[PDB]
Design a protein around this ligand. Sequence first.
Ligand SMILES: Cn1c(=O)c(-c2c(Cl)cccc2Cl)cc2cnc(Nc3cccc(CO)c3)nc21
Length: 466
Amino acid sequence: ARWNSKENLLAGPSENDPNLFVALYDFVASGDNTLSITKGEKLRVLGYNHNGEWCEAQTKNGQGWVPSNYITPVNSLEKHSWYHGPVSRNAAEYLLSSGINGSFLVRESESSPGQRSISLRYEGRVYHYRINTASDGKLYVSSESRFNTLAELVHHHSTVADGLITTLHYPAPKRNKPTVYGVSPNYDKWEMERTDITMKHKLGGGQYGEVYEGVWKKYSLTVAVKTLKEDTMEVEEFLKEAAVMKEIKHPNLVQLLGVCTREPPFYIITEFMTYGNLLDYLRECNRQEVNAVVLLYMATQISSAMEYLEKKNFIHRNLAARNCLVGENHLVKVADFGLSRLMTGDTYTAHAGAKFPIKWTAPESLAYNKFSIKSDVWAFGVLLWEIATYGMSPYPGIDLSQVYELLEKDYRMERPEGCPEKVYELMRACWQWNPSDRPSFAEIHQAFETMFQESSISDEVEKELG
Ligand SMILES: Cn1c(=O)c(-c2c(Cl)cccc2Cl)cc2cnc(Nc3cccc(CO)c3)nc21
């Protein structure tokens, strides 16, 4: 736990050549023309690939391609271990939910660009401070101590609290490397060699279909692999999923790594989420580690994924805790299998005779087999309840044959124990009988970010209990 570049905090912009870059995270080659780099390493950028997601760089070790958002200009604020860029208040509380006194970070508002804040951990609590800008541009927390640069402001408060609850001692660790959408900087290079993959045991006892844990030998990398059942040539369906996946690009949607569609058996290879589904995780987790701050963190990540699908005109229809996957640092990703393209202004009709997981299905879906992004919203509300109860089964003490009847009389699940009223009201909004009366995912995600801007969800939970 050290602050390496601390003795350089007060160094000038003019001491490094402007056009150079520095590595923000370690990157291990994922393709023959890709280049391995180490955090803190300097590089020279030669150019970008077709979508700007990758760039060709030169380091002392060689020349090659690396993820564009894995590096940053030498004089940018991003090089600082304590500048976490656009991070929300709640996310900040998560990043600082552990660590020694003095752990801190500086965050910006994606919402209101320019506005920055300092989040600090002291005696088990996180404190937030607005960084003000003077009429002449100087930054400050305490009106009597203004500085020209953010680094100088940070340096000052690492020497004396002067307004903060305590001093700035240790930049909080970054969550994790951003997601790389693929393994190659080149144009549509998804196809890979089937022999390069070692198939192992099936995942989730078959509840996800033909999905096996596997190993991409070349990179000593564990991956998930979905294969097509030959006993039923639904090839068109499977192939469609591969195509859709190639287009999906979001931090919280399971990422495609490659495919084997040249000849049978067809494969769809994705990243491996190491901790299984959110439902099992919630039920087996240590509730002291996975407290309210974490639940909110996870619920927020899931809404972000759905907001992305919402604007991309896709519907899910199987949104539930069991269809969410957990990775390192409580990272959650929604399983994007079975996605359907449906223009927001339009609805989908399932095949008569097809069964539905009743407890998560919206009224219009249970009665007319109709689905839309709004029925996904209804499902999210149920999933939110699963999160708030740490995995309980929905509608306790009620038989599936009465669910619809009860819903129709405006009955709804009770507020989970300790669940803050604000969160329960969001659930109720998702469970509005008319789909149009239900909030959009864009509105749901925003609701979470502005839900605890004054106190912490922990204190709220504390009041709901005692
Ligand atoms: C179950 N599952 C999938 O269906 C897909 C996937 C695939 Cl392979 C193709 C298309 C769409 C998706 Cl969502 C990806 C995926 C990635 N990681 C995991 N991890 C996982 C799930 C259950 C248990 C365990 C524990 O070993 C670990 N599970 C995954």
